[PDB]
Amino acid sequence: SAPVVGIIMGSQSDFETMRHADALLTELEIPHETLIVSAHRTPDRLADYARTAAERGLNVIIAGAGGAAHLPGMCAAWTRLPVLGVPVESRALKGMDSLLSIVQMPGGVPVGTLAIGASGAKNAALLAASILALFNPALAARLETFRALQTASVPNSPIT
Amino acid sequence: SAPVVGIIMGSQSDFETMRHADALLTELEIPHETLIVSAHRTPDRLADYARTAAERGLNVIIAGAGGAAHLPGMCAAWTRLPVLGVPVESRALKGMDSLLSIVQMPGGVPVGTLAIGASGAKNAALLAASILALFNPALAARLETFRALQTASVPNSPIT
Amino acid sequence: SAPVVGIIMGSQSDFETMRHADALLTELEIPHETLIVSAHRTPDRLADYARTAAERGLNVIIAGAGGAAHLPGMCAAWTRLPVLGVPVESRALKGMDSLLSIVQMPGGVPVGTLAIGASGAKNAALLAASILALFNPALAARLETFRALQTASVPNSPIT
Amino acid sequence: SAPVVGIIMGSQSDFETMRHADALLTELEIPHETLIVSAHRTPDRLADYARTAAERGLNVIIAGAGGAAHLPGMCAAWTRLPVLGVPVESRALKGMDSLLSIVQMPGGVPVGTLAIGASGAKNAALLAASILALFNPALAARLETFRALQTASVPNSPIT
Amino acid sequence: SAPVVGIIMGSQSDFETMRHADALLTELEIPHETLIVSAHRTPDRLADYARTAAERGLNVIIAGAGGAAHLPGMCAAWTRLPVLGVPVESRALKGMDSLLSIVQMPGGVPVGTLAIGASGAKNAALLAASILALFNPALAARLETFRALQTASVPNSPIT
Amino acid sequence: SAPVVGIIMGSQSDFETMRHADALLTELEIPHETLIVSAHRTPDRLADYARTAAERGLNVIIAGAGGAAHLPGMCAAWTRLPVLGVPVESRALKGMDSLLSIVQMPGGVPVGTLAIGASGAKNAALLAASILALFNPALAARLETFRALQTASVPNSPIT
Amino acid sequence: SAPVVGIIMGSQSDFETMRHADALLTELEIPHETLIVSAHRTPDRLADYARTAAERGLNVIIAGAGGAAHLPGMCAAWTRLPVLGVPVESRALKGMDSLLSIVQMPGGVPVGTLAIGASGAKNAALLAASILALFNPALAARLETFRALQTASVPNSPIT
Amino acid sequence: SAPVVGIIMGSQSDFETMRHADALLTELEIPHETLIVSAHRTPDRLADYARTAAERGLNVIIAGAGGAAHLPGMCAAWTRLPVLGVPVESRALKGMDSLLSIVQMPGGVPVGTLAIGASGAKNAALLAASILALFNPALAARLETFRALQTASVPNSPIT
């Protein structure tokens, strides 16, 4: 089935984080593509990817980047689609640079930013699902089931 | 027209920031409601608002809060709808507390987080518009026009 | 004996930290309950827990959470009891997000916040003990003994 | 009436913040004393104040300090009473120094820490009230009324 | 004379900072152009500007941006010329976001980063001058004179 | 020989850091004492230590502490001697809490603060030596020799 | 009288801070010189000042700088005298850059660092006084009087 | 061949980072020298190195330092050449002290600052290459080839 979410990242090393988005989309049966696009080393690849995303049938882009993390914001500059950004944990600053580089977009070009690291990647997929669910009833039901199970599965007391 | 976006905030003082979301939705002719809901002072109001949002026909919630900013995350805990979070600038820590309290959601319950302050409020409304545009062609064309004008209006040189 | 302190946390992983509160209450012979309550995944469980705590005979709630740490503040929103908050150390930001999310409560709904990590959990239990001691003379004597022994047990010189 | 809460601060300039604690205790009719005690300039005054607090009939101490904020922690070192700490906003670091100096107490000697600034001072008084309410039924009813009014008074919509 | 340095910035508001670079280049008689190029609002303008800079005869680009500051890094992605980056002071985070977004470039695509604000803009122009001086003897002598005067003009004692 | 520097710390665990001060004083033949004094668990021991230091013949106190690091500042509150403070690296915040708790003393009561960790402990000893050298010519010569050797011993090129 | 303390700073704008050191030394009748020495603009002036300080009869140097604050550390590199460092509050980062640039000296070359801003300047002068007092009995008595008055003058209650 | 870039660092331990600059210059066939120069332990070596660099035929200096990182800024104080600064990751503060100490140079004396750690060292070499390429066509072609290969070598999809 044709992809409706694009997951992009600058490097193979980012996939240790972004794989969590990939897995969650698959769990919710959301067709998607998962690609490497580097803002700094392949800027024309990024421009083409972002400019053509909507016409290719993508509805949401999930972009992960670390350090001076420009991939989500520059993707948003070229597409009218919602772009969700995942800050990848960086070695020295532990993703604080990633986070500020992604979330602090000036007024006019949004990036919906999730938590640093694997939690954020999982949540970017879930946020993409909640967006798609607004106009896909079958997915909405699967997401409802997912949320209800998550709630029902929380234990009542810890183990010593 | 029945609202499809809810803008909520904890206090009247937050409206100095959140009015920028309200104004943008009005500019794009997106029916919305703008309300005060305090996570800490009116937790049952929040629970009811979030639980019933989807059945009332809301599609996106934009929530702003400052300091120990819990409103967006608690809203997301009770609704399956996408929740967008705006960190309001706090007096002492200039919204760094707001930002971390909103963006660092654990895996399972997302909040798409925007920039600290007015830029974030504007961008939360634009992000909501881009979500709604996925299944509202007239709005999608208005959003295209908004982005095109924003791009075309940037001057080429600064004024002294 | 019926519990007078409730220790709550969002996950099993938090218990590595919160076990230190549990142990200290037991050492001072303070009856308590230790439970998992997730602000984000079980918000109705939290509402019920907090709203009924006083009528169940609890006097103090100790709540631990990490990241976007909303459990202590939302517990405080629903109960009139004193709520003590323990920031759990987070992977990337080392509990700075936990701390700011808990301590920066706006005026009107307090959370007494302790240090990041195990020290904070131990101290939340000791602070709960000092509160209970105000109207329990036997406990006051046990706490006095504990403090005096702590002071008397400090060595006079380090070992090389 | 004999004081049951002591509010202490290092300097006159701290009173701009700590007056909010004083006012709240007065509103709830909690007898208290409001004093200047400097950890750095009057350390023997502090030692005497803290050592004798319980025998004088105080039940809770609220201590405010800024910068290298040692007053709450040193007070706690000398009293078995609960000590609540208010970080005063500092000029350069906006209370981040105050906050870390107060909240990061090692295990064994607690300080329940509130938010930076006026919100923290108000909440320290409310937290003291919630402690006293555990064994003062008339006060407990006044605190219930305070919280109920706070909740009921939140507007439903913002004003322009 | 044809420009050999390009000064670019995302918005008119950035010129309050970047005018200090413009003024310094004028003082040293370095032909330059001063332009608005927004990474987020005019990404194709940026791509064209950077791609063609060298063929137009530019030797150094000075780029200023604030918040999620992507302009310098994206410029560097498209040109082989040295790119110098000036973090513009942001309202909430005082340029800490600007700084991390610019300086933390991954290996392979450099941005030489200067201080936050006006000092950085002045120094970006001086750094550009020192680069050009390596192959322009007349300029090298003017830069020597500038540095010598700066050194000689420092007073020996402060004024009351 | 009677001690002229006192090295104090709150716990045995601090000695992993403070041992570097101890060793440097011994290398420069400065008689000293090395003790455990806890600001929070032995506050009367601290008061007595600091109040009597000068009459016992101490000239400089080196105090190490971590977290909410109050030992150096409270020592300074009671003694007229110069007090040097060493921030001990803390687990979560890596000594940023230690540093701010020590260095940000309000006007009136100084602590000369050194770097976080072992470097700071070594430098506190060297700073104490430079103070003592002002009125001990033999020590001044030993310190001169130490500094000259340090300078002469720096290699000219690194090894691959 | 010949100066025994040198107060140096990089620029006239630093004097707004460093004048508090000057005033304190004058109050205690400690002969001193107050000079501008810029590490970055007058590095040879600095090298000469520091190299010759001891032979001129200076005993302590107090150095203030902001931003990338190198003056105290470079002074310490060239003199065997104790160097005390005052971080001047910077516009954007409020002296956090100043503080880290001064306090984080590697082992071997100390700078005793005081608080950011005016408090630090006052305390640098007081710390210099406490050093000189170790071998100047008349000054030691004046410093005792200063500390005693500071302690005795603290009010017991705040004014409204 | 005579060196045209000087790579300097304060210690052997810094070479684990600065070796990445050394390797990149060799890859691009840029003759260079790699030396240890300590700002704090060999300040006269630094003064001589920096003051004579241009007359020795150096065109660019790359300087690495950590902690209170003064080497790049003091090198820039004495040379008219462009100085590029590499913040070396520090143990406690993970290079945040290094970064602020290097990048926050006041107006008048620039240091072009690169990222914390190995990325920054690689990029300082690449930035030096882009500077030299402005007046060395053979190097410009090698740099073009390097950049084009970097772009062409980015994979299109990650591996699971």
Q: Which residues are within 8 A (CB) of D10 and not within 5 positions of it... i.e. 6 or more apart?
A: D36, D37, D38, D39, D40, D41, D64, D65, D66, D71, F106
Q: Which residues contact H30 (CB under 8 A, 6 or more apart)?
A: H4, H5, H125, H128, H129, H132, H139
Nearest residue on chain C to F91, alpha-carbon basis: C94
* Number of alpha carbons in the 13 Å side-chain half-sphere of residue F47: 17
Measured CA to CA, the distance from residue A98 to residue F101 in angstroms comes to 28
Residue whose C-alpha is closest to residue A25's, from A34, A13, A17:
A34
Instruction: Tell me the three state secondary structure of residue E133.
Output: helix
Using the structure block, give the residue that is written with the tokens 């669910």: A133
**Integer Cα distance of A128 and A131 in angstroms:** 5
Phi, psi of F156 (to 5 degrees): -90, -25
Q: Name the 3-class secondary structure at A25.
A: helix
Amino acid identity for residue A66 in this structure: G
How close is the nearest chain A Cα to the Cα of B19, in Å? Answer: 13
Say if CB A84 and CB A61 are below 8 A apart.
Answer: yes
Q: Compute the nearest-CA separation of H56 from chain G (Å).
A: 20
Asked if the C-beta of D140 comes within 8 angstroms of chain G's C-beta atoms, the answer is no
**What distance in Å separates the CA atoms of residue C130 and residue D111, rounded to the nearest whole number?**
11
- Residue C11 sits at the chain F interface (C-beta within 8 Å): no
Q: Distance between CA B29 and CA G133 in Å, rounded? A: 75
Burial class (CB in 10 A: 0-12, 13-18, 19+), C135: middle
Residues of F in contact with C116 (CB under 8 A): 92-93
Length, in residues, of chain F: 160
How far apart (Å, rounded) are the C-alpha atoms in residues F105 and F83?
12
Please judge whether C74 and B70 are an interchain contact, meaning their C-beta atoms are less than 8 angstroms apart.
Answer: yes
Residue E63 identity (one-letter amino acid):
A
Does residue B4 contact residue B60 with C-beta atoms inside 8 Å? yes
Residue A9's H or E segment, with its range, is: strand A5-9
Alpha-carbon span G132 to C41, nearest angstrom: 63
Give the strand order in the sheet containing B32-36: A32-36, A5-9, A60-66, A83-88, A112-113, B112-113, B83-88, B60-66, B5-9, B32-36
Task: Round to whole Å and give the CA distance between B94 and D89.
Answer: 12
Locate H159 and state its tokens: 């591996």
Phi/psi of residue H78, each to 5°? -105, -15
C56 at D interface, C-beta within 8 A: no
Name the residue with tokens 């107090």. Answer: G62
**C116 and F94 in contact by Cβ < 8 A?**
no
CATH code (residue B150):
3.40.50.1970
H100 and chain F in contact, CB less than 8 A: no
Query: Closest Cα of chain B to C132: distance in Å?
Result: 25
Q: How was this structure determined?
A: X-ray
Dihedrals phi, psi of G5, to nearest 5 degrees = -125, 135
Contact G17, G115 (CB under 8 A): no
Backbone CA torsion sign across F127, F128, F133, F134:
positive
Residue F115 CA: distances (Å) to CA of B119, F89, H139 = 38, 10, 43
- Parallel, antiparallel or unpaired: strands H60-66 and D32-36: unpaired
SS3 category, C85: strand
Q: Which amino acid is it at E114?
A: L
> D60: closest CA among C146, C60, C133, G156?
C133
Residue F101 C-alpha, separation from nearest chain D C-alpha, in angstroms: 5
Residue by residue, DSSP assigns chain F as ---SEEEEESSGGGHHHHHHHHHHHHHTT--EEEEE--TTT-HHHHHHHHHHTTTTT--EEEEEEESS--HHHHHHHH-SS-EEEEEEPPTTTTTHHHHHHHHTPPTTS--EE--SSHHHHHHHHHHHHHHHGGG-HHHHHHHHHHHHHHHHT--SS---
Residue F78 corresponds to which tokens in the numbers above? 């009671």
Sequence-separated (6 or more) residues with CB below 8 Å from residue E152: none
Q: Please give the C-alpha separations between residue A21 and each of A84, A149, C40, C92, F9, in angstroms, as whole numbers.
A: 11, 19, 19, 19, 48
DSSP one-letter code for G13: G
- Report the Cα–Cα distance between both ends of chain H, in Å, rounded: 47
Burial class (CB in 10 A: 0-12, 13-18, 19+), E46: buried
Category of C70 on φ-ψ map: left (φ > 0), alpha (ψ -120 to 50) or beta: alpha
Q: Is E33 exposed, middle or buried (0-12, 13-18, 19+ CB in 10 A)?
A: middle
Q: Give CA–CA dist A126/A114, Å, rounded.
A: 11
Six-digit token string for G22: 């000057």
CA dihedral D122, D124, D127, D131 (to 10 degrees): -130
Q: Looking at the DSSP assignment, which residues form a beta bridge with residue F84?
A: F62, F112
> Could you give the CA distance from residue C121 to residue D108 in angstroms, rounded to a whole number?
10
CB G17 within 8 A of CB D92: no
Of residues F15, F18, F42, nearest to C154 (C-beta)? F42
Whole-number Å distance between alpha carbons of D104 and D97: 11
Using an 8 Å Cβ cutoff, are H114 and E128 in contact? no
What is d(CA A154, CA C52) in angstroms, rounded to the nearest whole number? 20
The residue in chain C having the minimum alpha-carbon distance to the alpha carbon of residue B65 is: C106
Q: What is the 3-state secondary structure (H, E, C) of D116-131?
A: CCHHHHHHHHHHHHHH
As given in the structure block, the two tokens for residue A35 are 């690609």
C71-78 helix and B43-56 helix, angle to the nearest 10 degrees: 100
CB contact under 8 A, C35 and A156: yes
Task: Check CB contact of H121 with chain F, cutoff 8 Å.
Answer: no
Q: What SS3 string covers chain H?
A: CCCCEEEEECCHHHHHHHHHHHHHHHHCCCCEEEEECCCCCCHHHHHHHHHHCCCCCCCEEEEEEECCCCHHHHHHHHCCCCEEEEEECCCCCCCHHHHHHHHCCCCCCCCEECCCCHHHHHHHHHHHHHHHHHHCHHHHHHHHHHHHHHHHCCCCCCCC
Tokens of F149: 């050797």
3-state secondary structure of G111: coil
**What's the CA gap between F111 and F77, in Å, rounded?**
10
> Can you give the residue range of the structural domain that contains C83?
1-160
Note whether H92 and F89 are within 8 A (CB): yes
Q: Do A50 and A74 touch, CB atoms closer than 8 A?
A: yes
Count CB-CB contacts under 10 A for residue F120. 37
Chain E residue closest to A76 (CA)?
E40
From the list H46, H56, H72, the residue with the least C-alpha distance to H4 is H56
- DSSP structure string for D7-39: EEESSGGGHHHHHHHHHHHHHTT--EEEEE--T
Q: What is the DSSP string of A50-109?
A: HHHTTTTT--EEEEEEESS--HHHHHHHH-SS-EEEEEEPPTTTTTHHHHHHHHTPPTTS
The amino acid at D7: I
C63 Rama sector, left if φ>0, alpha if ψ -120 to 50, beta otherwise? beta
CA–CA distance, B80 with B83 (Å, rounded to integer): 9
User: Other CB atoms closer than 10 Å to residue D33's CB: what's the count?
Assistant: 16
Q: Which of D18, D102, D109 to mutate to test the interface with C (most CBs of C within 10 A)?
A: D109
| Chain H residues close to A9, C-beta within 8 Å | 158
Q: Which of G52, G70, G98 to mutate to test the interface with H (most CBs of H within 10 A)?
A: G70
> Looking at the 3D structure of chain C, how many domains does it have?
1
Rounded distance, CA B54 to CA E38, Å? 38
- Best of E11, E16, E42 to disrupt the B interface (most B CBs within 10 Å) is E42
CB-based contact, H89 to chain G, within 8 Å: no
Rounded Cα gap, residues H63 and D55, in angstroms: 63
**Residue at token pair 């306090």:** G103
Residue from H24, H100, H126, H145 to probe the interface with E (highest E Cβ count within 10 Å): H126
Contact between D37 and F77 (Cβ < 8 Å): no
Query: Distance between CA H34 and CA F157 in Å, rounded?
Result: 7
Q: Is residue C140 within 8 angstroms of chain D, CB to CB?
A: yes
G64: helix, coil or strand?
strand
- Of chain F, the end-to-end C-alpha distance in Å amounts to 47
- Cβ(H116)–Cβ(H90) under 8 Å? no
